Design an enzyme around this catalytic site. Structure first.
Site, mmCIF file in Angstrom:
data_model
loop_
_atom_site.group_PDB
_atom_site.id
_atom_site.type_symbol
_atom_site.label_atom_id
_atom_site.label_comp_id
_atom_site.label_asym_id
_atom_site.label_seq_id
_atom_site.Cartn_x
_atom_site.Cartn_y
_atom_site.Cartn_z
ATOM 1 C CD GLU A 23 -1.174 0.153 3.731
ATOM 2 O OE1 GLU A 23 -2.295 -0.470 3.735
ATOM 3 O OE2 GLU A 23 -0.802 0.901 4.672
ATOM 4 C CG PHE A 26 0.293 4.240 -4.392
ATOM 5 C CD1 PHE A 26 -0.466 3.075 -4.642
ATOM 6 C CD2 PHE A 26 1.501 4.118 -3.743
ATOM 7 C CE1 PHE A 26 -0.067 1.860 -4.215
ATOM 8 C CE2 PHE A 26 1.939 2.884 -3.324
ATOM 9 C CZ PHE A 26 1.169 1.743 -3.570
ATOM 10 N N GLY A 27 -2.636 4.296 -3.055
ATOM 11 C CA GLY A 27 -3.591 3.224 -3.237
ATOM 12 C C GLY A 27 -3.074 1.909 -2.750
ATOM 13 C CD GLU A 28 -5.090 -0.155 -0.559
ATOM 14 O OE1 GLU A 28 -4.373 -1.124 -0.123
ATOM 15 O OE2 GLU A 28 -5.520 0.808 0.165
ATOM 16 C CB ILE A 141 8.993 -11.553 -0.555
ATOM 17 C CG1 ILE A 141 7.903 -12.584 -0.922
ATOM 18 C CG2 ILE A 141 8.704 -11.010 0.842
ATOM 19 C CD1 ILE A 141 7.859 -13.824 -0.047
ATOM 20 C CG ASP A 180 9.812 6.591 -1.475
ATOM 21 O OD1 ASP A 180 10.463 6.616 -0.413
ATOM 22 O OD2 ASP A 180 8.594 6.472 -1.530
HETATM 23 O O1 LIG Z 1 4.235 0.507 -6.314
HETATM 24 C C1 LIG Z 1 4.528 -0.655 -6.033
HETATM 25 N N1 LIG Z 1 4.631 -1.079 -4.771
HETATM 26 C C2 LIG Z 1 4.346 -0.242 -3.615
HETATM 27 C C3 LIG Z 1 3.869 -1.055 -2.409
HETATM 28 C C4 LIG Z 1 4.856 -2.108 -1.932
HETATM 29 C C5 LIG Z 1 4.519 -3.543 -2.323
HETATM 30 C C6 LIG Z 1 5.767 -4.341 -2.309
HETATM 31 N N2 LIG Z 1 5.669 -5.738 -2.696
HETATM 32 C C7 LIG Z 1 5.580 -6.271 -3.947
HETATM 33 C C8 LIG Z 1 5.731 -7.648 -4.112
HETATM 34 C C9 LIG Z 1 5.842 -8.169 -5.365
HETATM 35 N N3 LIG Z 1 5.751 -7.284 -6.427
HETATM 36 N N4 LIG Z 1 5.933 -7.601 -7.726
HETATM 37 C C10 LIG Z 1 5.793 -6.403 -8.347
HETATM 38 C C11 LIG Z 1 5.552 -5.344 -7.467
HETATM 39 C C12 LIG Z 1 5.520 -5.942 -6.207
HETATM 40 N N5 LIG Z 1 5.425 -5.418 -4.975
HETATM 41 C C13 LIG Z 1 5.395 -3.904 -7.803
HETATM 42 C C14 LIG Z 1 5.671 -3.437 -9.090
HETATM 43 C C15 LIG Z 1 5.538 -2.092 -9.391
HETATM 44 C C16 LIG Z 1 5.133 -1.195 -8.412
HETATM 45 C C17 LIG Z 1 4.884 -1.639 -7.111
HETATM 46 C C18 LIG Z 1 5.004 -2.994 -6.817
#
Ligand SMILES: O=C1NCCCCCNc2ccn3ncc(c3n2)-c2cccc1c2
Ligand code: NA
EC number: 2.7.11.1
Length: 329
Positions: A23, A26-28, A141, A180
């Site tokens: 999260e 921005f959202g989810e 992860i 970030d």
């Molecule tokens: O904007 C994005 N993430 C922001 C929240 C953290 C989630 C973190 N955890 C994971 C786990 C597996 N994945 N696989 C792709 C992505 C991903 N994210 C991903 C890809 C692009 C943007 C974000 C996340």
């Protein structure tokens, strides 16, 4: 013409397999299976007047930077002169219309129950609400969740090397800054490859993987340019971004602002060095490795990472680090 229903991107079977994985304001972000293939879905409300997670929603125009940047970084896996798999694939982008699917609320609830959420339960959106849905390759992860799971400081070294290389390649091709790169935005996925390959300005090299491939994600704050056209998030009038405490993370935002004099359009690849320092710092202070560094070889790796921590802030970019820092020799 315009937006498609949620069900276009998220048919029943795909919705039924959604699990929330992260999260932000921005959202989810959810993980699911599309055509027997794991994917990550990032869902951002746009164009409405309601406050969402404490901010107003972006306009379509305001989301284009993140779309553009996601596409450029995704393209780097297939380029030649400047090539890296160290970001993440972008499979699709859609503009959808509808209220939030109950099945995603159910996934949202399970995440809130088990991990806690800082977000508003996204149940107040009406049936005319617009969202952007970005579908990405599933990258594994995050490093923060893996903080007690890694094998050794050799694994940490691999991770730092991979990150630095990926950032260098994006600097060279795109004058990219992530802006970030906290440890929640570093993904780890198992690989059976012993070595990973990148190419920087036409010169190819390898990194020992220690069984993991790193992906850098979340381009909400990122910046890059192409043919002198700059795409970025202008945070020059954000107050709250620069007033956090409790973690070195929150200092990084202030140190970026100092480096760039609050001019976010400019290129300052030192922001990449700052994030890498923050990440080295997490590696040395907040990880628990399954194998401690109680052999001479592993102690030696520790000393090199400590040396990196101590000296890296005197480098000017990820490229400078990669090409000149003793850690990577
Ligand atoms: O904007 C994005 N993430 C922001 C929240 C953290 C989630 C973190 N955890 C994971 C786990 C597996 N994945 N696989 C792709 C992505 C991903 N994210 C991903 C890809 C692009 C943007 C974000 C996340
Ligand atoms: Na990747």
């Amino acid at each position: 013409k315009g937006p498609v229903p949620f069900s276009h991107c998220l048919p029943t079977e795909k919705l039924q397999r959604c699990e929330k994985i992260g999260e932000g304001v921005f959202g989810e972000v959810f993980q699911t299976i599309a055509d027997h293939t794991p994917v990550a879905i990032k869902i951002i409300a746009i164009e409405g007047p309601d406050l969402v997670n404490g901010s107003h929603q972006k306009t379509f125009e305001e989301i284009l930077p993140e779309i553009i940047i996601s596409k450029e970084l995704s393209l780097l896996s297939g380029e030649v002169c400047n090539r890296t798999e160290g970001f993440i694939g972008l499979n699709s982008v859609h503009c959808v219309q509808g209220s939030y699917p109950p099945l995603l609320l159910k996934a949202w609830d399970h995440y809130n129950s088990t991990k806690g959420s800082a977000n508003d339960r996204p149940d107040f959106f009406k049936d005319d609400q617009l969202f952007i849905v970005l579908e990405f390759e599933f990258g594994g992860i995050d490093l923060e969740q893996m903080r007690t799971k890694l094998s050794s400081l050799a694994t940490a070294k691999s991770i730092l090397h991979q990150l630095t290389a990926s950032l260098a390649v994006a600097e060279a091709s795109l004058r990219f800054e992530h802006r970030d790169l906290h440890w929640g935005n570093v993904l780890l996925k198992k690989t059976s490859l012993k070595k990973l390959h990148y190419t920087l300005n036409g010169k190819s090299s390898t990194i020992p993987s220690c069984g993991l491939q790193v992906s850098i994600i979340d381009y909400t704050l990122s910046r890059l340019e192409r043919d002198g056209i700059v795409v970025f998030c202008d945070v020059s009038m954000d107050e709250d971004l620069f007033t956090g405490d409790g973690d070195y993370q929150f200092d990084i935002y202030r140190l970026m602002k100092k480096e760039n004099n609050n001019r976010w359009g400019e290129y300052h690849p030192y922001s990449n060095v700052l994030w890498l320092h923050y990440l080295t710092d997490k590696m040395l202070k907040q990880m628990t490795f399954k194998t401690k560094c109680n052999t001479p070889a592993m102690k030696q790796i520790k000393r090199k990472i400590q040396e990196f921590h101590r000296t890296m802030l005197n480098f000017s970019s990820a490229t400078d680090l990669l090409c000149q820092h003793s850690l990577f020799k």
